[PDB]
Every structure is written in C-alpha cells, then in structure tokens.
Structure 1
Amino acid sequence: PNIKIFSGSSHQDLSQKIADRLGLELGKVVTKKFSNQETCVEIGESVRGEDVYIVQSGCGEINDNLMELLIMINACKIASASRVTAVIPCFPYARQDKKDKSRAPISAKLVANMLSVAGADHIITMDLHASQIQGFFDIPVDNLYAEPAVLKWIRENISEWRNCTIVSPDAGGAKRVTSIADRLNVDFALIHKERKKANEVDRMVLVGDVKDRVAILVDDMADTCGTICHAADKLLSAGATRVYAILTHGIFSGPAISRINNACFEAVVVTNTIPQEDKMKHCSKIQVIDISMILAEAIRRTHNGASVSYLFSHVP
C-alpha cells in the first residue's frame, strides 16, 4: 500500500504542506457542493489497497467540512482502500465531550461514532480539547501535542522567558500550563472566571504572582477570545509587564479579531491546525506556528509502522 493524501475543503494549504513534506502530490479529489447544498465528493483516482489519509480540520463551515470528511471516508472505504485515516488537526465538537446538563448531547461521541461508521480505521489529531476523546473511538487515535512547538517558540521569541509565568486562562487549562511551566522551569498562575450566578459584573480571580513579569497565556483554543482577553485584562491589572497568548487552535470566530486588536497582547500565537491567512490580514498580533511537519511525520510513521513518541519531545 502507498500513502494517498486527500484534502477536504477546510484546510487545503495544510494538506499541501503535509504532501510536500511527504514528497507526494495531493490525491485528486473534487470537493464541491451540489446546487441544493449537498456535499459532492468526486475522488479522481483509484485508492484500491492504498493507505488513505484524509486531511480535514474542524473549522470554517463545521458541518459542511465534517460531512465532507465522512463522505470521503466512506467513498474510500467502498473503493476498497486498505486503510482510511482521518487527519483531523482540530477535532470538531470536541468541547461537547460530556453530559453535565439535562438532555445535553455528547456531540464529540456522536462525531466519533459517525467517523467510525463511515469506516475510519485511524484518527490523527492535535491537542484534543479532552484527551479522553481518544476513548470515544474503538480505533487507534493519535492525539499529537503542539507543546514541543510552543516551547520552541517561547524560547526563541520571548527574551525573558526564564523569568516568565505561564498563565492558565481557566481552571481546565491547569494541566497544560503546569506541564509547560515544568518544561520551562518557570512559575505558573491560574485565572478563573467565577460562575455567573446572576447578571452582575463578571469578575476574575487570579491565583499566583504575575507582578512585574511577562505573562504567557497558554490554552488549547481561542474561539471568541473572551477567555484570553478577560485573562489579559486581569493580568495587566495584576501588574504583568507584557502578556502573550499561545493557543494551538486559533478559531477566532465572531468578535475575536476585534477583541484581540483592542487587547494588550504582545502576540497571539496559534498553530496552523486551522487556516489563519484571513485572520492574520486583520490582526497583526497573530503569529502562526507551522505544525505541518508534525502531522507529516505522524502520517509517515503511521504508514511505516513506527512510533510517534518522538513527536512528543521534538519538533521535526
């Protein structure tokens, strides 16, 4: 079997980068819409007995892209592909990973079941919102970390990183922030927005010392940037000299760009798990860490039957 890399409509630049790093051309696929807005998928080459990797991030037109991915997976399976792997850099519906409300769906589990029934044999993803999403499948799920790439960026772009403090913008980010602070041998802090019992002012509590130090906000994603912007205001109010925000998934939906442009961030750093070209044109603060080498190495090692553990300590 040979590696066949197919791109959905979501992140074709990332698919191209992965294919170039693998020394391959992208597989021939036409991914369009019928007139009635139904997804049209036209695989333009044989995948018989091939090791098919379909790159599709959960971003942009989320349901459009997920349906595109499912249809492409099913087409490859029925076309007798040896193995179909869904390379999903940003897993859609990952934040709907539990039922903590009455009648609430576990949409991440539904997406996992849909991918399984479409015929996916393997999932490659980066920085799942909850790592337990790996357990939502009965197939192997590669949950790659952007943490080695983040540490590289911090050590190369922040002069006073050895005296910085890594700040969690919410309680759920504490593990990620503590891991990064341990790897950098720096202090960490946590910011919590307390629960909205009524319609008074949202107030943020900070635990840890950030006074007269550079604060680096690290989180898994910035959707509306309410979390990071509120954390940035709190950090400046607490005496932080400079505030950075580093995310792996830059969703930047809704008012995020205006929020960042009016915030105090020295830089907002995201990976290219989601296309950022449009976002960077309206926000100069955004910088992008390319993770295409990580995904390409993961795909290559999966095809060659080699461990991907190397990707959790080094940036290829």
Structure 2
Amino acid sequence: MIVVSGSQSQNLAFKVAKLLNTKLTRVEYKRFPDNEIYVRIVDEINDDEAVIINTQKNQNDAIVETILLCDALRDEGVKKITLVAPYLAYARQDKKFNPGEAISIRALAKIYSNIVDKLITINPHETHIKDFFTIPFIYGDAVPKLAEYVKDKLNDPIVLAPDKGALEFAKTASKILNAEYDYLEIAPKTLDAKDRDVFIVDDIISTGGTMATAVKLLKEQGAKKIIAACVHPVLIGDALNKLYSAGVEEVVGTDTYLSEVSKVSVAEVIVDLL
C-alpha cells in the first residue's frame, strides 16, 4: 500500500508511511495562476492499493483536491483507494434544522462512496453520519493519546466534559488517568473542583466560549491546574487568548487540524485502522 500525501497532511502522511515502513510517494501539488489545484503522482505506481491522507482544514480545497487525486490514481491502475481525512469537514450535522436546508454530509457521502472504497476519520462529531455512506466508514479515537499526554502533568485530576454531549471523551480519558469524571450541566453535575487539578476534554474547540466559560467557573470553584484538550483544535480567531485569559494552564490538540497547539499526533491511531 503506497501512501499518497494530500497537500494538507504532508507531515501526518509522512509519519504514517514511516510507521507502515512504506516509501512515501512523491505527489506534486501547486496552483495555476487561476488558483486552480494541480496535482500529480510523480513516482511510478506499481502497487494497486493507495491511501490518501488529506485532512480538511481548508474544506472545499480538500474536497476538490481529493476528487482530482482519485481520478489520477484510478487512471494509473490503482484498484483500491482508502481516504484518510483526519478532520472531516461538513460532517457536523445529522439532519436539517430548517426547511430548505441541505444535509451537507449526505451530499458529500454520495461523492465519497463513488470515488473511494473506504473512508477513515478521527473523532467525528456525529457518529451517525456513517448511515449516509455506502462504503466502509471507519472512525478512530484520539482521546486516549490526549489523556496520555497530560497524565504526565496533572496531579490527581478530575476529567470534565464541557457538556453532557462530550461525556464519553471524559470517560475514555478518565479510564487512562485512573481519575473520576463528570460533565458541566452551570457546574459539574456531581463532582466538585475545589482544590483540584482539572482535565477538560472535548472533540472540538472552535470559538472557545463553551471552554473559556467552563474554565472561568472552575477557577472560581477553586480549581487548581487546568488543562484543556481537544482532538480538532480549530481555535478560530482569538480563541486561544480567550482560554489563556480564563486561566488555563495549557491547551493541547492533535495534528488532524493545524493549530499553534497541535502537539499530539494521530499517526499511530490511523495506522491501526489501516
């Protein structure tokens, strides 16, 4: 299986290939004066099974680039194409919240099911979006890797989910840290943060409001060292400054989405799903 680098996951694809002990295929990527995408599989392809690793921080670019790469691979003999989109865009919702709307992941799943034979993604917000796919839809979990990153720097912490929705992430991390866990309902449903270290974990941190809010409160409830972790560090605008001011000790994310805090890698997580 050759590893094909998408323009948005060049380091992750490299790390994965290294783990798979596979030669990393040279993929040419550039923009015409138009700004149209130009892709090109430079190395010669003998193998007939490729794995495209291209996350979607720049959503529409990732979609088109992937479409073009698949065409290029098929036109070169590749029989099976697996797409690894660490961060999958347009997959936040399950349905319409208003008449006249579209179900974006539904429309894209149709295209994916036609151009690739398998799709892998890390920590999707909605697990049910797979119902729209007619090809294998595999999802890995990076929460364990985040937990392993902090057990090293927190003293008998309480693992909190920013809301009930993220309770599972807290539980997962909770098990790895041998700590208690709960979720803010505003305050934790059961536990008390007075004089305790806290590990707030969620799948995404965009705006930072939900997070910054939890932190300010927890600090008021006498929380000690607080670390906020997320799988997809979207961190829009001044999100990071917002969290730091609220008083977090540190914010950490993974490399599914490029940020100033993408410290943890999902390479191993991806390798296991291959």
TM-score, structure 1 normalization: 0.79
1:120 maps onto 2:116 in alignment: yes
Farther off after superposition, 42-51 or 64-73: 42-51
The 5-angstrom pairing of residues 154-193 of structure 1 reads 154-158=150-154, 160-161=155-156, 164-192=157-185
Instruction: Report if aligned partners of 1:48, 1:82 keep a CA contact under 8 Å in 2.
Output: no
Farther off after superposition, 176-185 or 62-71: 176-185
- Post-superposition CA distance 1:161-186 (Å, at most 9, x none): 3xx22111123212322343355443
Q: What letter is aligned with 1:247?
A: C
Query: Within 2, Cα distance between the matches of 1:290 and 1:121?
Result: 25
Q: What letter is aligned with 2:198?
A: A
C-alpha deviation, 1:240, in angstroms: 1.4
Query: Within 2, Cα distance between the matches of 1:34 and 1:80?
Result: 26
Residues 148 and 46 of structure 1, relative CA distance in 2, 3 Å threshold = same
Specify the SS of the correspondent of 1:233.
helix
Match of 2:256 among 263, 273, 283: 273
**RMSD between aligned residues:** 2.1
Match of 2:74 among 77, 81, 84: 77
Residues 152 and 182 of structure 1, relative CA distance in 2, 3 Å threshold = closer
C-alpha deviation, 1:187, in angstroms: 2.5
Hey, what does 1:68 align to over in structure 2? Answer: 65
The 5-angstrom pairing of residues 143-292 of structure 1 reads 143-158=139-154, 160-161=155-156, 164-192=157-185, 204-208=186-190, 209-276=192-259, 279=260, 286=261, 288-292=263-267
Instruction: Report if aligned partners of 1:95, 1:130 keep a CA contact under 8 Å in 2.
Output: yes
Instruction: Report if aligned partners of 2:6, 2:66 keep a CA contact under 8 Å in 1.
Output: yes
Query: Within 1, Cα distance between the matches of 2:96 and 2:179?
Result: 36
Residues 151 and 258 of structure 1, relative CA distance in 2, 3 Å threshold = closer
Q: What letter is aligned with 2:189?
A: V
Instruction: Report if aligned partners of 2:256, 2:266 keep a CA contact under 8 Å in 1.
Output: yes
Specify the SS of the correspondent of 1:35.
coil
Hey, what does 1:101 align to over in structure 2? Answer: 98
- Post-superposition CA distance 1:228-266 (Å, at most 9, x none): 111111211222122111111111222223223423111
Query: Within 2, Cα distance between the matches of 1:210 and 1:126?
Result: 30
Farther off after superposition, 76-85 or 256-265: 256-265
Residues 108 and 50 of structure 1, relative CA distance in 2, 3 Å threshold = same
Specify the SS of the correspondent of 1:129.
coil
C-alpha deviation, 1:147, in angstroms: 2.8
Residues 205 and 106 of structure 1, relative CA distance in 2, 3 Å threshold = farther
Q: What letter is aligned with 1:129?
A: H
C-alpha deviation, 1:289, in angstroms: 1.4
Hey, what does 1:36 align to over in structure 2? Answer: 34
Q: What letter is aligned with 2:160?
A: V
Match of 2:270 among 285, 295, 299: 295
Where do 5+ consecutive residues of structure 2 fail to align? none
- Post-superposition CA distance 1:134-174 (Å, at most 9, x none): 3221111221111321332233232x23xx22111123212
Moved over 6 A (4+): none
Hey, what does 1:26 align to over in structure 2? Answer: 24
Residues 103 and 186 of structure 1, relative CA distance in 2, 3 Å threshold = farther
Query: Within 1, Cα distance between the matches of 2:267 and 2:175?
Result: 26
Query: Within 1, Cα distance between the matches of 2:53 and 2:227?
Result: 30
Residues 272 and 77 of structure 1, relative CA distance in 2, 3 Å threshold = same
Query: Within 2, Cα distance between the matches of 1:258 and 1:151?
Result: 23
Hey, what does 1:201 align to over in structure 2? Answer: none
Residues 179 and 295 of structure 1, relative CA distance in 2, 3 Å threshold = closer
Query: Within 1, Cα distance between the matches of 2:173 and 2:14?
Result: 30
Q: Share of identical aligned residues, percent?
A: 27
Query: Within 2, Cα distance between the matches of 1:28 and 1:217?
Result: 39
TM-score, structure 2 normalization: 0.90
Instruction: Report if aligned partners of 1:96, 1:105 keep a CA contact under 8 Å in 2.
Output: no
- Post-superposition CA distance 1:192-243 (Å, at most 9, x none): 4xxxxxxxxxxx4542322221121110011222221111112112221221
